[PDB]
Structure formats: C-alpha cells, structure tokens
Amino acid sequence: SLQPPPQQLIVQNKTIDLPAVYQLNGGEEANPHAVKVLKELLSGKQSSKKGMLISIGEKGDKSVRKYSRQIPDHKEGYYLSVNEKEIVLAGNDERGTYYALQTFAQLLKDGKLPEVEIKDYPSVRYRGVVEGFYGTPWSHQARLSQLKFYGKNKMNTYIYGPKDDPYHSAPNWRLPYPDKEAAQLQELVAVANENEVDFVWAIHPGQDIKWNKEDRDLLLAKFEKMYQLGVRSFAVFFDDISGEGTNPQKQAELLNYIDEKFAQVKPDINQLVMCPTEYNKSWSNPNGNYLTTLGDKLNPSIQIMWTGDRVISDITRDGISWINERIKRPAYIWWNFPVSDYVRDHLLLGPVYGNDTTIAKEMSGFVTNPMEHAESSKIAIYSVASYAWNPAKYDTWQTWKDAIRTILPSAAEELECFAMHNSDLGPNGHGYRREESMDIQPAAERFLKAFKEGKNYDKADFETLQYTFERMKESADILLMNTENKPLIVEITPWVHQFKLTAEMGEEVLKMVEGRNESYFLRKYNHVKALQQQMFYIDQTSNQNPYQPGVKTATRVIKPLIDRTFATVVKFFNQKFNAHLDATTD
Ligand SMILES: CCCC1=N[C@@H]2[C@@H](O)[C@H](O)[C@@H](CO)O[C@@H]2S1
C-alpha cells in the first residue's frame, strides 16, 4: 500500500519490467537527492543508443518540458508515469522530484513496475515531528534513523526541541553547543538536507529570559551559531514556563525582531515558528488577551503552534476555527501523541486516529510529539505522515498495519499483537485515553459477567482468551530475539518481558477456572502468585524514572480481566473448601 496515498492515481493492469538497459534524461539538471535515489534503484546500463527513456526533473528543466501540463501546480507536487514506452519523474520543485522517487521506490516490486499515472502533492504544507517531550532526548543514532524515515514518508519537518537539552532550554540556551554536540547537529542538518527535511532548531528561553538587549542579542548570537552549522529553520518556544517570559507583547516583539534582523536578512531561511504560552483552548484566559495580542502583533509569516482544545487532544473543525479566529492565520498543529512523558510506564503503540480529516486547509502544519522511544514512535509517525499528506484518504487501521510491516517485516504479526495490547495510557492527569485490545474485549466482558454472577461461561470465549495468551507469548519471545531492528527491541524489552508474564499469568488463571482437583488448583494458584511477584519485580527495577516509574502492559482489558477472574475462582475455592487463600493481586 502506498504510503502516503497519492492525490490522484490511475492504475493500468499492465506491469512492465524495470529496464535492463535505459536512457537517463535530466540526471544533471534534476534534484541530486532525487537522482541519488534513482541511481540506487537502477542496476545499469546507461545507453545514449537507447534504452527505455527515463526523464527526471523539476518544472523548468529541459528534461521534463513535454510534461509540464501534467505537473501539479502545488509546492512539493510531482507527476509520475510508468508505461511500456517511458518513465516520467517530474517535480513541481526539487522536493517534489524527491517525493516522486519516494513513491517510485514503493511501486518497484521484484524488479517490476505497474503501469501507472500519478499526480500528487501534500494537503498540509508542513508535516513532521517535534522532538519536544520531557525525558531522555533521542540518541544521535536514533535521530539519524528518524530523518531517513521522514524522507521516505514525505515528512518535510523535524523540529528539534527536547525539553531536557540544556543548550535548548534554561540557563544554557545562551551558550553555543560544545564542539562535540555542534559537530553532531551539523551532521543531523546534512542528513536532513539529503532527505528533504527542514531541520527546525528550537530555543526555549522564556523561563529566565530578561526582556533586555543583552538576552535578545544572546538569542540572535545563538541563532547565528546554529546558522553556521547549517540550520535554515528556527523556532522560539514559550510553553510550560512561568514568570516574566509569558508576556505576549514581549514575545511577539522578540519574534518580530528575529524576523526583521535575521529571517529577512539571511538568503535562505525557511520556517520561523513560535510556541505560545497559552497553547490549548482550555488553558487560555477568555477575558484577557494573550492570543489576540499574538494574532495581531506577530508578522504574518511567523507560525503559531497549537495542541487543540486541551493539552492532549485530537483536532476538530470547531477547535481549529476557534484558534484560527484569534491568531489570524491557520494554526500549526502540535499533536500530543504518542508522547508518553506523563505516562512513562506505558508504551503507546496503537493506531493514529481522532483528528478530523477534512480540515487540511485550516492548518499550516501538523507535527507529532512522540515518545522518548524513537523507533517505537515510528508506528504513529508513519501514520501521521500518511494523514497529513492525504487526510481525505486517511485509513487508521491499514496505515497502522502498513507502518508495522514497514518497520518490522520479519515479525510484523508479532509486533501487531504486541502493539494491539499496548495502546492505552491508563488513568492520567490529562484524561486522555486510547482504545486497547478491542478484538477480545467482548469475549473478556461476557466471560467476566458470567462469573461475577455464577451463571456458566461460553466455551468460545474461553478459548479466545486462551488463544490470546498463547499468541502473546509467541510474539513476546520472537520479538525479544529479533535482530532486524535491534534498537526497537531494546526500547520495548522491559514491556516485552512484562507482556509475556501477563500472558503466562493469564494461562494459569484459566487453568484455575477449569480447576480439575484441589491440589492442581493450588499448584496453579502458587504459580500465579509467583508470576505476580515477577511482574512486581520488573515494575520496581525497570524504567525507574522520577515520575511514572515502572512497566505497565495490556492494562485496559487484559490485566483487569486476569486480575478479576483470579480473585473470583479463589473466592469460590475459599467457600468450596472453606479456605484462607489470599485473593489479592497487588
Ligand atoms: C504547543 C504545545 C507545547 C507543549 N509543551 C509540553 C510538551 O513539551 C509535553 O511533551 C506535552 C505532554 O506532556 O505537554 C506540553 S504541550
């Protein structure tokens, strides 16, 4: 499944061979990043003698002159054609040609191509990821991997802003990066450039900013240093601060200054973005004028970020109208999923859903704030990419499955199993929840009512529950040993162990339900207590962060079911055999 889905696609049911011998036209005129990709896909030979013709270029290039009517007149648009006679890979601009090739790479299966005509472009101008979470910032290796992933999925934005990076936030936003870190950011910028991603470097100065000439110059001098490392897009974040830094008038003046004396002065600055102190509807003062000050005061080329009606929320038609009215421009959406920095004992690996698919025109950008777990975040990131490029065609579940199969082809069904029951956030201070384990939730619910009653269960149910636990262990063990994406396995390991132990506990609890004789029952019960203690051990020793320490898994439907069934069969036993068994699950 292409990924993101093109705006317009016509498939002829013919398929052609990737040319054994070919004629390249435009190789020296077209986007070198695109030509690179094309040349990688091709295993010789070049032939002036001909050779099937492959034409590559941007609108204006001599190579693509014949097809200029065909090229969509949109930023990052392109036209792609495959037929018996010719291949055409024509961008509206340089990024469009790179994107043509990202679609092209996906069509080529087993050295063959379908016969297709594609006219394509993004529905939202800026699409990508803000690394803007609290916690351990992404490793340098994880970032290099992200930027390549962003290029393949036509994401054009990476906003660097980890809350915990000292040279991004207070005090030390005033200081240039040390040489080591500097050389690393330089490398990130090179790699982002190669992949057609705007590396957007953010600063977060508002906690100790002085509204004086000294701090203002320090900010520009920092921006200048970042420029010298290759950075061409900038942001100033005023989120989650208090004190003098929250002053909207001073914020707008600062940003206008940066625009005027820096963004409008360098030859090639792309994005200039700001993050308001009031960044969702629920935390905005209706009677005072924070957001209208920004909307009126800020130069119209400056972006303003927004999370929707609450800190964590999905974007609605009503929600975007509300903010767009006040800021006098389309909001640049910061979506807080799958961001887990306030539910740090959970992994959030379910589908991306909830955002209205008809409001592309009402947003200038759409970025996802992810987990501190970089590779794990690729399931959502891939999905957000698909959503922000073609929201009209956005399919929740298929994109999720596509993401998983792209990330881990070798164990995709195993990863789906694991992700399916690692979706929900649990109870949290923001009240944001996701669905989890819905496949088995009716079976779970029937089975459990038919017990907390005494009314006999369904055999169908019993073996779906048992089928589930079995599948959970298979997936957990296969994942642990998977070497195709080791960094992903490393992130999820603790939850993989916990997920296995949940499945095992599940299986023993059901063996207790079929309790054949008194002492097989007690073997089961004792095994359950031992498995509980192992889960408690992991929860006490893994992921011991100061905020939500530990490791929770399958918490919405599966853990509750097992816990409740266990306390139930035990209580029936404490009355058939008049016992004193501990029925507790903590
Ligand atoms: C335009 C929104 C700016 C925001 N800043 C923080 C962010 O750093 C956290 O990652 C997120 C979830 O805890 O909560 C808020 S949202």
DSSP string, 114-156: EEEEEEE--SSSEEEEEE--SSSPPPHHHHHHHHHHHHHTT--
The verdict on the CB of residue 334 being under 6 Å from ligand 1 is: yes
The span from the CA of 64 to the CA of 205, in Å, is 47
78-82/112-120 β-pairing: antiparallel
Tokens linked to 507: 């299986």
Mapped to the 3 state alphabet, what secondary structure does 289-358 carry? CHHHHHHHHCCCCCEEEECCCCCCCCCCHHHHHHHHHHHCCCEEEEECCCCCCCCCCCCCCCCCCCCCCC
The answer to whether 318 is a known catalytic residue is no
Mapped to the 3 state alphabet, what secondary structure does 15-31 carry? EEECCCCEEEECCCCCC
Q: Who's near 218: CB < 8 A, 6+ residues apart?
A: 174
How much helix, strand and coil, in percent to the nearest 5, is found in the chain? Answer: 45, 15, 40
The span from the CA of 407 to the CA of 421, in Å, is 18
Helix (H, G, I), strand (E, B) or coil at 367: strand
Query: Number of C-alpha atoms within 13 angstroms, CB side, residue 299?
Result: 17
Q: Calculate the CA dihedral of residues 87, 93, 99, 101 and round it to 10 degrees.
A: 30
Q: Who's near 232: CB < 8 A, 6+ residues apart?
A: 198, 199, 266, 268, 269, 270
The verdict on the CB of residue 132 being under 6 Å from ligand 1 is: yes
The verdict on the CB of residue 165 being under 6 Å from ligand 1 is: no
Q: Who's near 477: CB < 8 A, 6+ residues apart?
A: 500
126-131/86-91 β-pairing: unpaired
- Give the angle subtended at the CA of 66 by the CAs of 60 and 71, to the nearest 5°: 60
State which H helix or E strand residue 383 sits in. Answer: helix 378-389
The span from the CA of 17 to the CA of 87, in Å, is 11
The best mutation among 275, 278, 311 to test binding of ligand 1, ranked by most ligand atoms within 8 Å of the C-beta, falls on 311
78-82/86-91 β-pairing: antiparallel
* Atom 3, ligand 1: residue with shortest CA distance: 239
The span from the CA of 54 to the CA of 32, in Å, is 15
Ligand 1 centroid, distance to 133 Cα (angstroms): 6
In the 8-state DSSP scheme, what is residue 58?
A: E
Give all domains of the chain, ordered by start, each with its CATH number: 1-121 (3.30.379.10), 122-407 (3.20.20.80), 408-586 (1.20.58.460)
Q: At what angle do helices 486-513 and 459-480 cross, to 10 degrees?
A: 150
Ligand 1 centroid, distance to 134 Cα (angstroms): 8
- Give the angle subtended at the CA of 178 by the CAs of 172 and 181, to the nearest 5°: 105
| Ligand 1 atom nearest to 163, measured from its CA | 8
State the Rg of the chain over Cα: 27
The span from the CA of 10 to the CA of 81, in Å, is 10
Is residue 238 within 8 Å of residue 246, measured between CB atoms?
yes
Quick one: how many helices (H) and strands (E) in the chain? 16, 14
Ligand 1 centroid, distance to 132 Cα (angstroms): 7
Q: Who's near 276: CB < 8 A, 6+ residues apart?
A: 238, 239, 248, 251, 290, 291, 294, 304, 305, 306
112-120/86-91 β-pairing: unpaired
The span from the CA of 125 to the CA of 172, in Å, is 32
Q: Who's near 474: CB < 8 A, 6+ residues apart?
A: 414, 417
Query: Number of C-alpha atoms within 13 angstroms, CB side, residue 293?
Result: 19
CA nearest neighbour of 240 among 356, 132, 367, 148: 132
- Binding site for a protein, by residue number, is 132, 163, 239, 279, 334-336, 341, 369
Q: Residue type for 93, please?
A: D
CA distances from 434 to 108, 132, 228, 420, 427 (A): 36, 21, 43, 11, 11
The span from the CA of 376 to the CA of 386, in Å, is 17
Method underlying the structure:
X-ray
Q: Residue type for 300, please?
A: P
The verdict on the CB of residue 240 being under 6 Å from ligand 1 is: yes
363-368/126-131 β-pairing: parallel
The span from the CA of 406 to the CA of 1, in Å, is 10
- Binding site, by residue number, is 132, 163, 239, 279, 334-336, 341, 369
Q: Quickly count: other Cβ atoms within 10 Å of residue 108's Cβ.
A: 14
The span from the CA of 230 to the CA of 245, in Å, is 28
Tokens linked to 413: 């069904």
* Atom 4, ligand 1: residue with shortest CA distance: 239
The verdict on the CB of residue 133 being under 6 Å from ligand 1 is: yes
Q: Who's near 519: CB < 8 A, 6+ residues apart?
A: none
CB environment 71-100: b (16+ within 10 A), e (fewer): bbebebbbbbbbeeeebbbbbbbbbbbbbb
The span from the CA of 584 to the CA of 576, in Å, is 18
In the 8-state DSSP scheme, what is residue 279?
A: -
* Atom 15, ligand 1: residue with shortest CA distance: 311
The verdict on the CB of residue 238 being under 6 Å from ligand 1 is: no
The best mutation among 309, 320, 336, 366 to test binding of ligand 1, ranked by most ligand atoms within 8 Å of the C-beta, falls on 336
In the 8-state DSSP scheme, what is residue 175?
A: S
- Give the angle subtended at the CA of 363 by the CAs of 362 and 365, to the nearest 5°: 165
The span from the CA of 201 to the CA of 161, in Å, is 7
Q: Who's near 514: CB < 8 A, 6+ residues apart?
A: none
112-120/8-17 β-pairing: antiparallel
The verdict on the CB of residue 311 being under 6 Å from ligand 1 is: yes
The span from the CA of 496 to the CA of 144, in Å, is 25
Q: CA 250: distance to chain centroid?
A: 33
Peptide bond before residue 122 is cis, with ω within 30 degrees of 0: no
The verdict on the CB of residue 305 being under 6 Å from ligand 1 is: yes
CA nearest neighbour of 271 among 360, 355, 163, 161: 161
Query: Number of C-alpha atoms within 13 angstroms, CB side, residue 203?
Result: 31
Specified resolution (Å): 2.2
CA nearest neighbour of 231 among 275, 187, 169, 175: 187
